[PDB]
């Protein structure tokens, strides 16, 4: 049982600095190298630098030399990775991973000659880092009506729009949780202004138009905003 | 009457600064200067200390005298190839210029990622000289290290020839602290005459050699332990505490005499 | 430092799928000893094969890799069941090099049924002059859906947003595309259409003010 714990998700304005911590467990923290790699949305992985937990030796990449800086803590196995002068380009999921090669044996005083890469066998759960130049703000909720022409027995759908909210997640429930069947919350769409926008729809019977009252409940914990909106034909 | 300075005038002397003649052949960090030198008499200072990995040599007396009586420290570079292993293992107790180093004339093998398969390599000697191979067997101080270095609980070293064979299975145990290292190495030697072959076969725990030595047996070469340093006078005789330059055949100085020297 | 991988691999269940890997001149031909990984959607990746062909404790025998000159391949010969994931690859070319990634698709019936529903801008949006239109596509199996907007039989490209197809609870997919404009542009035009080209059947939804 080997596990890697990473610090929580963070949002920074451009030009700020970020610090992420990785805490190992179940293996000798000083007997293996340590890697740091990021994965952009819809992109592949990109390695940054490695650090020697037994000596503190480091080696960076050219793209991140002068901005990133690693650190190690012998007690409690927490490694760190500070990136200074970050920019809007660096939006990626940063991972911490242990190299498979053993380099030292402390009881028998053995050491490996040089280092060779073979594979990163253990990965951290990942730290989602967002870098956007906007202001934190709650959403703007607007309703969406049902079908215009209908008969008896045919289903009709009505939605609930959410727009212009900067921090990532929103939670939408219908009738405080009583209306579950048909609820499908569509994922957001990043706009050219920076703020996301999604919508939640639910299929309902046409005979219940005007009979049952339907209210969408939107919660936005980052700015502490809760908006309830009733939809009417 | 004796002189307090050793004078090499016709003879050949070598100052073993910080190296006993045994550690001089292994290639310890302080023994870089001695390599590549012939001699008739090797001076061994009593202040010579251990520098590299703590070790022990069974039948140390034989290897000391054999290395002494040949008077040739030249080392033949023979390229060994090792299969599915990692070579050039270094140690921290063996510090050379504050870089974690190993014996300059030896090679330490360790498993790579997941296995340490059976090694099988030979070197037949057809040269006009006998070959001396110096190798060691590493004893882990814990059973857990026995599988991290060599991936086998019952390690084995079996170095054979056409007449002899020596199979050693290392014993695991904790030794007292000698430069922060509780592990020991057992060094053995095997002489290979012309027309004889030498075989190496180890499933684990081998300190492999990087070659062999040149042997010129039945040649005048010897060793002497003393603290008296070398001078610049002329004499063919050297004793346990100085040189003797007298004509009287009966001189009561010492019992250790090298050369055409007057008797007791 | 290229380590190029195919963009996608399609295969039927019960057969084998091969995902090759090639780099540039002598970059990958470097005592390969390559590694591979498997990354499920929204999950951390796992190491499946290291040193090109060896497996660690836990991976079944279905995963395998082999040496083909400058190319390194990976074979998945078992009844694919949950192998739908993004497969990456990594070697050493001065600074550990990573591959683009290949997504495996477990075979299933298309059963295409977008059921597009276009929704007019609400009165409160029109008050705020936001003037946003909502198209909702759902219940289709394939990977990608193509959308193109047009108003009054004139193609609209200014102010359109489109999201990635999202896997539903019943293994189908869905997505939503938006359109932002001004109320003075909505009242003047007489119709707003939303065309989804989905491997054969165009959606017929169109909203009238
Ligand atoms: C170790 O290797 C030797 C062979 O020599 C070494 O490996 C070669 C592949 C090659 O790289 C060479 O350069 C290198 O020196 C193996 O020795 C062979 O032994 C066979 C007999 O069985 C095995 O050895 C005996 C002594 C016992 O230890 C048994 O437990 C082993 O199973 C011999 O093979 C036969 O020899 C016949 C001679 O008349 C021949 O006619 C047959 O066709 C057949 O080859 C053979 O004597 C010998 N081979 C050589 C080249 O000497 C040995 O098996 C390897 N393994 C071990 C553990 O020692």
Number of domains of chain A: 2
Helix content of chain B: under 10%
Quaternary structure classification: heterotrimer
Through-space gap between termini of chain A: 57 Å
Shape of chain B from CA axes? elongated
Number of strands of chain A: 20
CATH superfamily of the largest domain in chain A: Immunoglobulins
Q: Taking Cα atoms only, what radius of gyration of chain A do you get, to the nearest Å?
A: 25 Å
What count of helical segments of chain B does DSSP give?
3
CATH structural class of the largest domain in chain B: Alpha Beta
The ordered string of helix (H) and strand (E) elements of chain A is EEEEEEEEEEEEEEEEEEEE
Largest interface: A-C, 41 and 43 residues
Proportion of residues in β-strands of chain A: over 45%
Could you say how many structural domains of chain B there are in total?
2
CATH superfamily of the largest domain in chain B: Haemagglutinin, alpha/beta domain, HA1 chain
Based on secondary structure, the structural category of chain B is mainly beta
Number of H/I helices of chain A: 0
**Proportion of residues in extended strands of chain B:** 25-35%
Question: Can you walk through the features of this model?
Answer:
The complex is a heterotrimer of chains A (233), B (264) and C (209). Chain A is an all-beta fold. Helix content of chain A is 0%, strand content 47%. Chain A is built from no helices and 20 strands. Chain A has strands at residues 3-6, 10-12, 18-25, 34-39, 45-51, 58-60, 68-73, 78-83, 92-99, 104-105, 110-111, 120-123, 127-131, 140-144, 155-165, 171-174, 184-185, 196-205, 214-220, 225-231. Chain B is mainly beta and 264 residues long. Chain B has 2 domains: 1-11 and 229-264, no CATH class; 12-228, Alpha-Beta Complex (Hemagglutinin (Ha1 Chain), Chain: A, domain 1), CATH 3.90.209.20. Chain B has 3 helices and 18 strands. In chain B, the strands form 6 sheets. Chain B has a 4-stranded antiparallel sheet with strand order 3-15-9-12, with no helix packed on it. A 4-stranded antiparallel sheet of chain B has the order 8-13-10-11, with no helix packed on it. In chain B, strand 10 and strand 11 (165-168) form a beta hairpin. Chain C is 5% helix and 39% strand. In chain C, the strands form 4 sheets. In chain C, strands 1, 3, 4, 7, 8 and 9 form a 6-stranded mixed sheet that branches. In chain C, strands 10, 11, 14, 15 and 16 form a 5-stranded antiparallel sheet that branches. Chains in contact: A-B, A-C. A molecule of 5 linked components (NAG-NAG-BMA-FUC-FUC) is lined by residues 120, 122, 201 of chain B.
């Amino acid at each position: 049982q080997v596990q890697l714990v990473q610090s929580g998700a963070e949002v920074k304005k451009p030009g700020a600095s970020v610090k992420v911590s990785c805490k190992t467990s179940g293996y000798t923290f000083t007997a293996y190298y340590l890697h740091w790699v990021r994965q952009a949305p819809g992109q592949g992985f990109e390695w940054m630098a490695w650090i020697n937990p037994n000596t503190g030796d480091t080696n960076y990449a050219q793209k991140f030399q002068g901005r990133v800086t690693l650190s190690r803590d012998t007690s409690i196995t927490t490694a760190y990775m500070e990136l200074t002068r970050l920019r809007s380009d660096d939006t990626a999921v940063y991972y911490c991973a242990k190299d498979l090669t053993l380099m030292y044996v402390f009881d028998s005083g053995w050491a490996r000659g040089a280092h060779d890469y073979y594979g990163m066998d253990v990965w951290g759960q990942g730290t989602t880092v967002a870098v956007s130049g906007a202001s934190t703000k709650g959403p703007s909720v607007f309703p969406l009506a049902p079908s215009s022409k209908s008969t008896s027995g045919g289903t009709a759908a009505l939605g609930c729009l959410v727009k212009d909210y900067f921090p990532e997640p929103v939670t939408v429930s219908w009738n405080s949780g009583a209306l579950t069947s048909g609820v499908h919350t569509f994922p957001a769409v990043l706009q050219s202004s920076g703020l996301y926008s999604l919508s939640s729809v639910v299929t309902v019977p046409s005979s219940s138009l005007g009979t049952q009252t339907y209210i969408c409940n939107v919660n936005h914990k980052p700015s502490n905003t809760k908006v309830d909106k009733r939809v009417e034909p | 009457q004796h002189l307090p300075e050793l004078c090499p005038s016709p003879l050949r002397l070598v100052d073993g600064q910080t190296c006993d003649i045994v550690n001089g052949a292994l290639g310890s960090p302080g023994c870089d200067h001695l390599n590549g030198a012939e001699w008739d008499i090797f001076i061994e200072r009593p202040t010579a200390v251990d520098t590299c990995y703590p070790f022990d040599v069974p039948d140390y007396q034989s290897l000391r005298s054999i290395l002494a009586n040949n008077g040739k420290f030249e080392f033949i570079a023979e390229e060994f190839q090792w299969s599915t292993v990692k070579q050039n293992g270094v140690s921290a107790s063996c510090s050379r210029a504050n870089v974690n180093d190993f014996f300059n004339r030896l090679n330490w093998l360790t498993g790579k990622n997941g296995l340490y398969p059976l090694q099988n390599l030979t070197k037949i000697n057809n040269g006009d000289y006998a070959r001396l191979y110096i190798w060691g067997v590493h004893h882990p101080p814990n059973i857990g290290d026995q599988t991290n270095l060599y991936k086998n609980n019952p390690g084995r070293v079996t170095v054979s020839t056409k007449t002899s064979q020596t199979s050693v299975v290392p014993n695991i145990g904790s030794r007292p602290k000698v430069r922060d290292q509780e592990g020991r190495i057992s060094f053995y030697w095997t002489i290979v005459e012309p027309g004889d072959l030498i075989v190496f076969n180890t499933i684990g725990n081998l300190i492999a050699p990087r070659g062999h030595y040149k042997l010129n047996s039945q040649k005048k070469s010897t060793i002497l332990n003393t603290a008296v340093p070398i001078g610049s006078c002329v004499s063919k005789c050297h004793t346990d505490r100085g040189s003797i330059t007298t004509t009287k055949p009966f001189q009561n100085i010492s019992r250790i005499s090298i050369g055409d020297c007057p008797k007791y | 430092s290229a380590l190029t991988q195919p963009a996608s691999v399609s295969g039927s269940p019960g057969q084998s799928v091969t995902i090759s890997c090639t780099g540039t001149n002598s970059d990958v031909g470097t005592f390969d000893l390559v590694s591979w990984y498997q990354q499920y959607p929204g999950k951390a990746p796992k190491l499946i094969i290291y040193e090109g062909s060896r497996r660690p404790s836990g991976v079944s025998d279905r995963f395998s890799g082999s040496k083909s000159g400058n190319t390194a391949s990976l074979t998945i010969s078992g009844l694919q069941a949950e192998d739908e994931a993004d497969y990456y690859c990594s070697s050493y070319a001065g600074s550990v090099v990573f591959g683009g990634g290949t997504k495996l698709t477990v075979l299933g019936q298309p059963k295409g049924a977008p059921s597009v529903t276009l929704f007019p801008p609400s009165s409160e949006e029109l008050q705020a002059n936001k003037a946003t239109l909502v198209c909702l596509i759902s219940d289709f199996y394939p990977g990608a859906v193509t959308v193109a907007w047009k108003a009054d039989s004139s193609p609209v490209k200014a102010g359109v947003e489109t999201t990635t197809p999202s896997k539903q609870s019943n293994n189908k997919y869905a997505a939503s595309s938006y359109l932002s404009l001004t109320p003075e542009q909505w009242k003047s035009h007489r119709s707003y259409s939303c065309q989804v080209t989905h491997e054969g059947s165009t959606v017929e939804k169109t909203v009238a003010p």
